[PDB]
Amino acid sequence: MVIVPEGTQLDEKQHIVINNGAEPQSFDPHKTEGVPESNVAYQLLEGLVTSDSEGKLQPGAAESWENTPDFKTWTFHLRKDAKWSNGDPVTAHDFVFAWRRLVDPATAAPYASYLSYLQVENAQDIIDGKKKPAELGVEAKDDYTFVVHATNPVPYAVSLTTHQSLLPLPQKVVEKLGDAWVKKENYVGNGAYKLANHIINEKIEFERNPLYWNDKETVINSATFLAIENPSTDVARYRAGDLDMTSYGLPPEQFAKLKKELLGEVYVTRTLGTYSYELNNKKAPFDNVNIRKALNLSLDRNVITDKVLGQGQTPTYVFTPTYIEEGHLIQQPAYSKEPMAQRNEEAIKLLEEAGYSKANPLKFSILYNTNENHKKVAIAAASMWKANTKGLIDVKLENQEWKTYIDSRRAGRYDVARAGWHADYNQATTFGNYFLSNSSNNTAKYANPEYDKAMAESYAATDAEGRAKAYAKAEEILGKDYGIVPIFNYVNPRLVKPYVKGYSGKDPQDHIYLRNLYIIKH
């Protein structure tokens, strides 16, 4: 109804097929940290606030909310008639239950730190085993009023609440079934869809959740998510007419021709994302700053963005995208403005000083998730690091399936890993928070108490300028330590069939909510 322009002739079936790119780790939002996982979670569950086709915030499970003028108390007014898919009522108790479970050490959640980022009273103490989960600073004031108590001002709090990690869970179900609640037979959610089927490595089928509070505005009746790893295979299925929307990678070598032949089907979203090679800071020899610096100097970003990809990705030398809100004072480092000849000279010296030569080069593997585009970037990186250092680096490639790749990065079983970080919310700390010493997201094992202190100063600021200065200083410190190898800021290219509507190409987080889409007839 409302999302559909008047007069628009809708197709009768309303089925859509989307490539989700990989088999998700889990459908439990406390056990996951990836885009494939969040894409599934967002169809089955809905948090306090959610977003439209352009990423603008809109009421979710909460119909209204407010904050105290100090930005420390956040009150959410929940819908009195909203239900779980089994008929249970959705209440503030479910949010209290879910947010406690997220920080509870027993959950071992990859995103435990998220409530620490939000500065929720006692979140960090709970993660650290010093306080019980019941001591977390959130409460059901009554069944339909959920209150969040932050120890520091967090003016961007509402945007943080759209993240998968803060989705509610059906307390009554999870308390009874444990971790097994996530099985298809048991899953209960408050989102627009429910799980109709799941075949590992093949497909996830979604069906309408008729008990969704806003089911009357949902148009798509059913959807399939595929798990096609390689952009070229994604495009081949699309052109065979067997899927309707690709994942957010397209083959660089096909890109020009696809724009020519598929007019109005090629979308490119400019997103708040950074593609990096993460260095394992606690594994020899990347514990050596001199070697981390050599790798940064000797990698020519323009080769990757202009010659390997060429889809609008832009080179970067910092973790935070500088165009994110409050990111504007972050500076690209000085070396980024030196000619490659100078950079390569400096890198070779550093590597010789560290005992490498053509006969005894620095050897390591780039770990990446199986994907032909990542392979291309890794080959170009391998090739550049060898030639630019005159044979002093010799790089192997190792691809793993998504789930294995995530496990390997979290377990520290890597030298150098391909890493993409997409904003959890449209403000700088979604990047800055990543490299805090104690962040559950910090798989790099980067730890500088001076980085942590610079970030901490942001909460003492009283305005966006004060915050932006603190974030600039944090990034400067991360830059001087060469903690990682930033490569580019993302663009998200997709093919979308012309009968698919409600995909904007303008959402800086490029979410796809099935409830935002519709299939037209003509």
């Binding site: 885009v35 969040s38 952009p231 593609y275 990542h374 970080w421 904003a423």
Partner: peptide
């Protein structure tokens, strides 16, 4: 969020 693609 960790990104699958690029």
């Amino acid at each position: 969020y960790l990104g699958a693609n690029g």
